[PDB]
């Protein structure tokens, strides 16, 4: 019968590893680097677009940074199509929570549920896992500013600063070196860009090859604002830090 | 939940020494309208059984189709289909009785009253009744509808108990049935003059009589009846 | 070799290896014999034990008052097929007030075994059956094989060393067929038949198993001291 | 639905998928359980290759199943969340129907049953997780400590360890733990648990987690400074 | 609107002795004011020395008996030809009846036989499965006529020892099979006189350790 | 790979045969049947000294009149016991009586072959089912994952089964008392066990008509162990 | 019987590659060249009509398809896969948008729905990926004119101008030199025809070339009058004659 | 059919455990079907249940309850609580709510952790813990005798009489109650049956010995 053609996506190796999860992580390691840095008064999300062409429409484009709700955003590393499936599910889950409790969903609860979906694909169903790693940046009234990451295994962890995708080993060393706890958003913006600038596989880091976003309490009195940076705004912040 | 539309009235029957007789008129009533006049309500199954059906005619035609299909199915992979493993009256009855009770238990009955008349392989007479409720009973005489009220009393004067069956001939039994059909024509408003009659004998087999008529009727005394009490002219 | 992974695959010579491997399970099973006259039908079965401390595996199963079988091979598969026969016999009685013909019983078993040999996932039944019975056309003996093939016979035997008993019955055909109105003599012929398949072991009181059905005899099984008469 | 039998027998009578699930447990961070005279202590390793972590929000290794029972584990982290969720639901379901909280044995038997079901169900792989379940039965002061594993077998332990280098720490506990006289106090039990982890861990900084459970739903997690005091005390006594 | 129930009349009677038990019933079957049959048996030998009758709506009655007879057959298959005790049969019948709690069998069921000590046993059921063991039970159309007579003659109710100022009751004792049949016959001839649905014939099934015996008696046919 | 319900060329189901190898790796379990009762005994086999041996539950009650001992992948037995208990209680509900030991065993064995591509694999555990009923009296059954069950006068299963079965062949007779049977289980267990037999690493149980199924205390078994050693030294 | 293929046929290899997607892209590479160019006041999409036989009527086979009145599509790769995607794309525009909001979806969202369908064929049980790359041109009130590419993986990218299929590498280079942000629609059509001539080998005329535009509203193509707000479709397929007129002044 | 029959059942907590007392009459309209009905259901040796409302509904589901209680103690190696046993039954009938079950029962037991415990369980889903409960057509008559004479420090002998006398009061006045009285005493070690008492003989006996029922000539 059909047994002959089954790859058996949800099995253990002799060493106790999940083949498909490991190979999905290998796929993600070739994706454009994405960095998240958490400050005391906000969060930064920075991501490198995958080898840009000059005729690509840059201003009306979205590849790396997606909005989940007014208080939570994600940076993507891996297959974009896979990420969008998961993103729509996460958007729906956030609204279900708001409908039920009349309160915005706590960041971890959203992360846990999305990670539990990934876990399912590794344990049952016989389907390939989602080839995606997320960096979740968000705010709630319980824990304040929070950074998480999830990967195809469905395992998630919290971070002060973290990178996913390509050159994470080199990127994590640079972040570990220059990061400190009393850091501001404006300083974190500078760290994120400097790190990408050194770890990039490109010749020089430019505005057209980047996506950028912040989550500050920079709005008027005790409320959070999401800023997805425009092309011209990235051009300005790149000059202001002295990279170009 | 149903309501019957086109209906057939009484079916009457009795046992005699060597077999059974069954009869029913050829009418399909549509309420008070006597709409259809060429309706056969006696349906033979093989050469040893006759099923007489009253009530809803659309449901009767459905049962005809089931019995016809039953004969076909019994012949499959059956070298003795025309011998030892042929369909018996008791087999045909139990099948119908199962169906009738199952349909009443689904609140969607076959709106019929059925009498299965025949002779078994060992020569024993078979006569049993079943209706829309799945109710079953057997008796030396059986009748449905008005026949139960008017025919049974006449047929029970011939065969009042089991011991009267060997004493009753086919000539006497047929005479009583034909007389009963006349009485029903006198007194049942949804009956017709034309009818069918079937005899299943253990020796002479199945005899199926069509296009019979009620005859030797008494109507002459009607001319002497005037008014409703006092009237003289 | 490459064509025996499942029942859905034909070999280049047109063989179904899984069905043949199921047939092999019957050959390993203990011997059982079936034979009939015109009035009665008899099953004789050599029961097998695990060791001296264990009981002897029951080989004969009753299906109705007028029908039953003996098994050889996987016993659980016989339980499934015998249960199916019990239901079919019972359906015939409740719906049609009719005792199920032994021939139809065979046709129903054939069709049930067949479906398991044409579909992916499932497996063939790993047991052979000898069905006896008395119906409206007299006494009957059937041989069921899990390939689906059912055969009506005067006498037969299945299991290990069944060729010896089968040869004997082929010689004795003219004699035992005319044993009418005599149960004990028909059994004796069956006990002598199964004896031709014995090696080193002999028929003891808790080893032998006999069953009979006939004209004025319901399907009944004899075990223990009740078979001491025939040793 | 996906039906494939993934967990099956091999010629030598082994179910490799279940045994490979144990290898995943062997890869996981070390977890230890020690029960005293009036308490149970759950110790857990945290690998130190991960700096720049946020310990406020990062999932804790020890999880509360109810107010009186806790669950720690070794193996795949994602798999453990599924067992913990099911256990928490069953804990509330038991309170709803029996009008009484679960016993530690019952909760363990349920979790072990879930693990077993995944070893002979079509289309699923076994959980790459072994758990240590500890607590106190309602209106009872006798300490309970149970262990489960991917196959589904479970059993009670005076003291036990699971995860990487667990055979080393089990060796330590086997000579240091006395059945006739278990740790009489909370301090003694915690110290023995920390000592056993110090045979394997590396440094006693932010690598060791300790959770103490006492009778009548009295559970508390120790902070860094509190744990560091045990580490400082043990090392000074060692130099002798 | 279609009414799935009907009333086929008739009445039944079960009495238990010391080493025997009887289950009687009239043979008349009716609908409204018509007689369907003068001899239609509704007391059946179900095997294992158990006799059974399910009186009321005959279609439901035949279905129940048919299902119980089948239950006995499968009990033998599944439990190595073990004899089904009267108490086990009773519990089984409860589950048959209660299985249709929300679309009931419109019948009053009575079974009779011998218990495991060899003593006479009668069990009676309501339409939805409540049951009870009793020495005496009448069921059906004329139950209200027969039962108070049984109370008086079998269980000696309201009868006191002569001269004892109504202080000493008449002592309970087992009746012979001959005396019980006398009470059954007199019960049915009295019911026949005063109930229109009762008559034609009387069929009694007697159960002893030896087996099941039958007796038939004529009743008035009007 | 290959199908789960596949036959070998010799005519056996691969998966059933492979599950039998798993049962050989399991701890020893012995059962002996007498006219005074049936005795069941098992090797606990703790993997480590820190493991509390009293939590090892390899002897189990099904009903008051039926007991059960297991050997092999013991986790697989839980659903078998659950089914057995339900079958026993359900029959009591339907028939107001105790259920026959054979009928109970047959119900358990019907689960055995309900696997394929139903559960994904056969059970990797064998069961010794002991009990009493009015018809056939004291009984002992051996239920395999093949769906087959044999009745036994005495039976051993597990790692030391072939050695213990040969010993039971010589020792068993039809006039054994209950006390004699208890000692005989302990004697044979001590012979095949790796570690030295005592009350903590071995467990006894029995089923009698009068008192029903009972698991023995560690205090009671300890005295029977002491009684056993004295009798062997006495000649 | 029944579909027993409930498992993924596309899986990750040790190197991290999704084989079936890569092989699907290889099939797209073999496919005939198609392109799209965005202007200030419109969008153009074009492709070569590779005829299987001269007896075949190439008019009956439409490589450029209307999805909504303001959205069009063209492809490179396997034609049958494209045809069923167009059917599904048209239906999803109604079921998941027009029947809810009473208006046609904007280009980006319809593209998103098509991408979803193609992603599912990459992960669902018992199916292979679609062997096509789409170019979807469209207009909507709030986003204006737009051009999107969709790949077998389900990934989609917005383009100022691009090409896919056989000679896409050379064609993209040609478009980089010619494209600017001040291009009028007629200039974009002219560049499209120049770019396409390089990849086409045989005959180059209105019968062998298929070309459509997303431009101004066409009241004459609406089919009715009376509702002022309804002004007609922005999608228009250029005729064989209209193409040949522009090939003279080339 | 007729499931709506009369009854008088009671159960009360006291110093020495629980007393359970019931009548024995079953009626189909005015017709007295039986005088020998068992209205106490012996769920197991430690638990009792009372029958009121549907006879079948009470019999069937309280026997079923005994099966669930046996499975509980096999799995947990511990006696089931009265709370847990009552809740299994109440949750079950709640699933059937609206279908037409008719039930009014007292689930009675005596355990270590709880002591003597009574739960009134009812077919519309009600589950009440309490000290005194009376259910049936004659419940009002029985309550009057109970309320006026009840004390926690009653002896076992006096408590048994009180339950017997309360049923008699109902049997006398309520037409659909009578026949005989069945008594039970529930202790921690199990229930004890205290016999069947014909109301006919019991009435005259109580009249003479007590001096009550002067309105009745005897
Ligand atoms: Mg009369």
């Amino acid at each position: 019968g059909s047994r002959r053609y089954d790859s058996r996506t949800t099995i253990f190796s002799p060493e106790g590893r999940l083949y498909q999860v490991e190979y999905a992580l290998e796929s993600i390691s070739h994706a454009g680097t994405a960095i998240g840095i958490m400050a005391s008064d906000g969060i930064v999300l920075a991501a490198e677009r995958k080898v840009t062409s000059t005729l690509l429409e840059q201003d009306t484009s979205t590849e790396k940074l997606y909005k989940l709700n007014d208080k939570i955003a994600v940076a993507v590393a891996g297959l974009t199509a896979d990420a969008e499936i998961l993103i729509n599910t996460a958007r729906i889950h956030a609204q279900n929570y708001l409908k039920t409790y009349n309160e915005d969903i706590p960041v971890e609860i959203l992360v846990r549920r999305l990670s539990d979906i990934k876990q399912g694909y590794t344990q049952h169903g016989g389907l390939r896992p989602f080839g995606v790693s997320f960096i979740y940046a968000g705010y709630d009234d319980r824990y304040g500013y929070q950074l998480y990451t999830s990967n195809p295994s469905g395992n998630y962890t919290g971070w002060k600063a973290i990178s996913v995708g390509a050159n994470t080993s080199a990127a994590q060393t640079l972040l570990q070196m220059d990061y400190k706890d009393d850091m501001k958003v404006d300083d974190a913006i500078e760290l994120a860009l400097k790190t990408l600038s050194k770890t990039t596989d490109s010749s020089a880091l430019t505005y057209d090859r980047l996506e950028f976003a912040t989550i500050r309490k920079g709005a008027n009195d005790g409320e959070v604002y999401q800023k997805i940076f425009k092309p011209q705004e990235i051009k300005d912040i790149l000059v202001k830090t002295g990279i170009t | 939940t149903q309501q019957p539309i086109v209906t057939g009235t009484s079916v009457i029957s009795m046992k005699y020494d060597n077999g059974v007789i069954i009869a029913a008129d050829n009418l399909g009533s549509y309420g008070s309208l006597l709409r259809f006049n060429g309706v056969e309500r006696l349906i033979p199954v093989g050469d040893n059984t006759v099923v007489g059906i009253s009530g809803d005619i659309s449901d009767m035609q459905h049962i005809e189709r089931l019995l016809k299909d039953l004969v076909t199915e019994n012949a499959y992979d059956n070298p003795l289909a025309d011998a030892e493993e042929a369909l018996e009256p008791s087999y045909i009855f139990e099948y119908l009785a199962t169906v009738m009770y199952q349909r009443r238990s689904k609140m969607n009955p076959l709106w019929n009253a059925i009498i299965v008349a025949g002779v078994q392989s060992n020569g024993d007479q078979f006569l049993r009744y079943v209706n829309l409720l799945g109710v079953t009973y057997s008796s030396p005489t059986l009748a449905t509808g008005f026949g139960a009220h008017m025919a049974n009393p006449l047929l029970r004067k011939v065969v009042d108990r089991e011991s009267d069956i060997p004493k009753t001939t086919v000539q006497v039994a047929e005479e009583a049935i034909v007389n009963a059909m006349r009485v029903l024509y006198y007194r049942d408003a949804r009956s017709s003059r034309n009818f069918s009659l079937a005899i299943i004998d253990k020796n002479t087999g199945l005899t199926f009589k069509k296009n019979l008529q009620v005859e030797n009727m008494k109507w002459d005394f009607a001319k002497d009846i005037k008014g409703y009490g006092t009237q003289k002219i | 070799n490459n064509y025996d992974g499942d029942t859905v695959t034909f070999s280049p010579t047109g063989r179904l290896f899984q069905v043949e491997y199921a047939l092999e399970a019957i050959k390993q099973g203990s011997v059982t014999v079936g034979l009939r006259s015109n009035t009665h039908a008899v099953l004789v079965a050599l029961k097998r034990n695990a060791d001296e401390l264990s009981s002897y595996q029951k080989k004969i199963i009753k299906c109705d008052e007028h029908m039953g079988l003996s098994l050889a091979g996987l016993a659980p598969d016989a339980r499934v097929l015998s249960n199916y026969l019990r239901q079919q016999c019972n359906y015939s009685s409740l719906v049609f007030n009719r005792k199920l013909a032994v021939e139809r019983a065979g046709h129903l078993l054939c069709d049930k075994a067949q479906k398991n040999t044409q579909s992916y996932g499932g497996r063939p039944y790993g047991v052979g059956l000898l069905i006896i019975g008395y119906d409206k056309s007299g006494a009957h003996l059937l041989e069921f094989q899990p390939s689906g093939n059912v055969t009506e016979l005067y006498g037969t035997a299945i299991g290990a060393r069944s060729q010896g008993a089968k040869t004997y019955l082929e010689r004795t055909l003219d004699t035992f067929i005319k044993i009418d109105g005599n149960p004990d003599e028909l059994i004796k012929a069956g006990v002598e038949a199964i004896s031709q398949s014995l090696r080193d072991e002999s028929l003891t009181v808790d080893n032998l198993s006999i069953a009979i059905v006939g004209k004025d005899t319901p399907f009944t099984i004899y075990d223990g001291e009740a078979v001491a008469k025939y040793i | 639905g996906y039906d494939r039998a993934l967990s099956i027998f091999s010629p030598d009578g082994h179910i490799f998928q279940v045994e490979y699930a144990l290898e995943a447990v062997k890869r996981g961070t070390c977890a230890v359980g020690v029960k005293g005279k009036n308490c149970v202590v759950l110790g857990c390793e945290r690998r130190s290759t991960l700096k720049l972590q946020d310990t406020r929000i990062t999932p804790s290794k020890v999880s509360k199943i109810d107010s009186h029972v806790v669950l720690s584990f070794s193996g795949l982290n994602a798999d453990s969340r599924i067992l913990i969720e099911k256990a928490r639901v069953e804990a509330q379901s038991h309170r709803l129907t029996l009008e009484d909280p679960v016993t530690v044995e019952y909760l363990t038997r349920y979790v072990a049953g879930v693990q077993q079901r995944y070893t002979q169900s079509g289309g699923v792989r076994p959980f790459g997780v072994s758990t240590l379940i500890a607590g106190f039965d309602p209106r009872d002061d006798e300490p309970k400590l149970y262990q489960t594993e991917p196959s589904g077998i479970y059993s009670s332990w005076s003291a036990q360890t699971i995860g990487r280098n667990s055979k080393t720490v089990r060796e330590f506990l086997e000579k240091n733990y006395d059945r006739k006289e278990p740790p009489a106090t909370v301090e003694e039990c915690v110290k023995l648990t920390v000592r056993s982890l110090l045979e394997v861990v590396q440094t006693g900084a932010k690598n060791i987690e300790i959770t103490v459970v006492k009778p009548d739903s009295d559970i508390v997690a120790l902070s860094s400074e509190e744990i560091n005091q045990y580490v400082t005390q043990i090392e000074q006594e060692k130099q002798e | 609107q279609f009414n799935p129930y009907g009333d086929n009349g008739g009445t039944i009677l079960g009495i238990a002795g010391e080493d025997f038990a009887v289950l009687a019933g009239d043979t008349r079957n009716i609908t409204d004011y018509s007689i369907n049959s003068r001899y239609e048996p509704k007391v059946f030998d179900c095997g294992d020395n158990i006799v059974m009758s399910a009186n009321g709506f005959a279609a439901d009655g035949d279905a129940l008996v048919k299902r119980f007879k089948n239950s006995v057959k499968w009990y033998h298959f599944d439990h190595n030809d073990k004899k089904l005790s009267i108490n086990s049969a009773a519990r089984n019948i409860q589950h048959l009846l209660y299985g249709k709690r929300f679309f009931p069998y419109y019948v009053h069921t009575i079974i009779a036989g011998l218990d495991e000590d060899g003593k006479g046993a009668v069990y009676s059921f309501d339409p939805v499965g409540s049951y009870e063991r009793e020495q005496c039970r009448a069921g059906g159309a004329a139950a209200s006529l027969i039962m108070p007579f049984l109370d008086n003659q079998v269980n000696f109710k309201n009868q006191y020892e002569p001269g004892t100022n109504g202080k000493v009751k008449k002592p309970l004792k087992y009746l012979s099979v001959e005396e019980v049949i006398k009470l059954v016959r007199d019960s049915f001839t009295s019911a026949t006189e005063r109930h229109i649905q009762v008559g034609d014939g009387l069929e009694i099934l007697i159960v002893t350790k030896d087996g099941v015996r039958k007796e038939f008696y004529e009743l008035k046919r009007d | 790979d290959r199908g789960v319900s596949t036959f070998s060329p010799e005519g056996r189901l691969f998966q059933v045969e492979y599950s039998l190898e798993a049962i050989k790796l399991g701890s020893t379990a012995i059962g002996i049947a007498t006219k005074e009762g049936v005795v069941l005994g098992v090797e606990k086999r703790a993997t480590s000294p820190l493991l509390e041996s009293d939590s090892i539950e390899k002897i189990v009650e099904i009903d008051r009149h039926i007991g059960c001992a297991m050997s092999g992948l013991t986790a697989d037995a839980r659903s078998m016991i659950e089914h057995a208990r339900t079958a026993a209680v359900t029959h009591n509900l339907y028939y107001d009586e105790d259920i026959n030991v054979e009928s109970l065993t047959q119900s358990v064995c019907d689960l055995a072959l309900r696997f394929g591509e139903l559960m994904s694999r056969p059970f990797g555990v064998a069961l010794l089912i002991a009990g009493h009923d009015a018809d056939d009296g004291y009984q002992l059954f051996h239920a395999e994952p093949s769906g087959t069950f044999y009745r036994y006068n005495a039976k051993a299963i597990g790692s030391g089964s072939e050695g213990a079965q040969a010993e039971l062949l010589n020792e068993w007779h039809s006039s054994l008392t209950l006390k004699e049977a208890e000692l005989l289980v302990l004697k044979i267990l001590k012979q095949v066990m790796e570690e030295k037999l005592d009350e903590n690493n071995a467990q006894l149980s029995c089923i009698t008509k009068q008192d029903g199924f009972k698991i023995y205390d560690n205090e009671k078994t300890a005295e029977l162990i002491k009684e056993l050693k004295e009798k062997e030294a006495a000649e | 019987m029944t579909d027993r293929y409930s498992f993924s046929l596309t899986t990750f290899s040790p190197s991290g590659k999704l084989g079936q997607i890569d092989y699907a892209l290889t099939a797209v590479k073999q496919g005939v060249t198609s392109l799209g160019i965005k202007a200030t006041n419109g969008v153009v999409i074009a492709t070569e009509k590779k005829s299987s036989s001269p007896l075949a009527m190439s008019e009956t086979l439409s490589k450029v398809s209307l999805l909504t009145p303001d959205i069009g599509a063209v492809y490179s790769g396997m034609g049958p896969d494209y045809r069923v995607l167009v059917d599904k794309s048209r239906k999803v525009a109604h079921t998941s948008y027009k029947r809810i909001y009473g208006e046609y979806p904007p280009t980006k969202l319809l593209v998103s729905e098509v991408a979803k369908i193609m992603q599912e064929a990459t992960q669902s049980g018992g199916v292979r990926p679609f062997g096509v790359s789409l170019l979807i041109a469209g207009h909507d009130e709030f986003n204006g004119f737009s051009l999107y590419q969709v790949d077998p993986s389900g990934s989609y990218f917005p383009w100022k101008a691009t090409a896919i299929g056989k000679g896409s590498v050379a064609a993209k280079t040609f478009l980089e030199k010619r494209w600017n942000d001040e291009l009028e629609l007629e200039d974009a059509i002219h560049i499209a025809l120049l770019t396409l001539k390089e990849s086409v080998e045989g005959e180059f005329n209105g019968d062998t070339i298929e070309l459509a535009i997303i431009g101004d509203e066409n009241p004459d193509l609406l089919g009715y009058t009376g509702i002022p707000t309804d002004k007609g479709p922005r999608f228009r397929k250029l005729t064989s004659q209209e193409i040949n007129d522009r090939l003279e002044a080339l | 059919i007729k499931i709506a029959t009369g009854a008088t059942t009671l159960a009360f907590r006291f110093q020495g455990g629980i007393i359970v007392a019931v009548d024995s009459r079953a009626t189909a309209g005015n017709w007295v079907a039986s005088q020998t009905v068992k209205k106490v259901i012996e769920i197991n040796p430690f638990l009792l249940g009372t029958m009121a409302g549907g006879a079948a509904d009470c019999q069937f589901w309280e026997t079923w309850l005994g099966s669930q209680c046996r499975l509980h103690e096999l799995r947990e190696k511990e006696r089931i609580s009265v709370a847990a046993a009552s809740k299994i039954l109440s949750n079950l009938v709640y699933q059937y709510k609206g279908a037409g079950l008719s039930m009014g029962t007292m689930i009675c037991g005596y355990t270590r952790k709880e002591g003597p415990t009574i739960y009134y369980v009812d077919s519309d889903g009600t589950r009440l813990k309490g000290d005194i409960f009376c259910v049936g057509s004659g419940q009002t008559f029985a309550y009057g005798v109970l309320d006026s004479n009840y004390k926690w420090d009653l002896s076992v002998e006096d408590a048994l009489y009180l339950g017997k006398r309360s049923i008699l009061a109902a049997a006398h006045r309520d037409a659909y109650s009578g026949g005989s009285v069945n008594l039970y005493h529930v202790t921690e070690d199990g229930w004890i049956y205290h016999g069947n008492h014909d109301v006919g003989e019991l009435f005259w006996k109580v009249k003479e010995e007590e001096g009550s029922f002067n309105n009745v000539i005897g």
Side-chain angles (χ1 to χ4, degrees), chain H residues 166-189:
Chain H
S166 299
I167 293 292
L168 180 64
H172 182 52
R173 285 288 184 171
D174 180 21
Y176 303 105
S177 282
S180 62
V181 186
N182 281 120
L183 283 174
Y184 284 85
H185 178 218
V186 187
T187 67
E188 195 184 313
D189 292 344

Side-chain angles (χ1 to χ4, degrees), chain E residues 91 94-95 98 101-102 104-106 126-134 137 143-145 147-148 157 160 169, chain H residues 1-3 31-38 55-57 59-61 63 96 99-102 198 201 204:
Chain E
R91 179 65 72 78
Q94 168 170 80
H95 279 80
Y98 202 91
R101 169 63 177 78
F102 302 112
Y105 291 110
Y106 215 114
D126 82 342
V128 281
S130 79
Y131 74 102
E132 184 199 332
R133 192 185 173 173
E134 328 189 66
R137 170 61 71 196
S144 59
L145 286 75
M147 201 66 191
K157 296 277 177 77
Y160 289 90
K169 302 175 79 176
Chain H
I1 72 182
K2 304 185 190 182
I3 72 176
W31 161 244
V32 175
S34 184
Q35 301 265 48
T36 57
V37 174
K38 274 196 76 180
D57 294 331
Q59 264 192 9
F60 190 88
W61 289 116
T63 310
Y96 283 95
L101 291 184
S102 182
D198 185 72
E201 297 161 49
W204 296 123

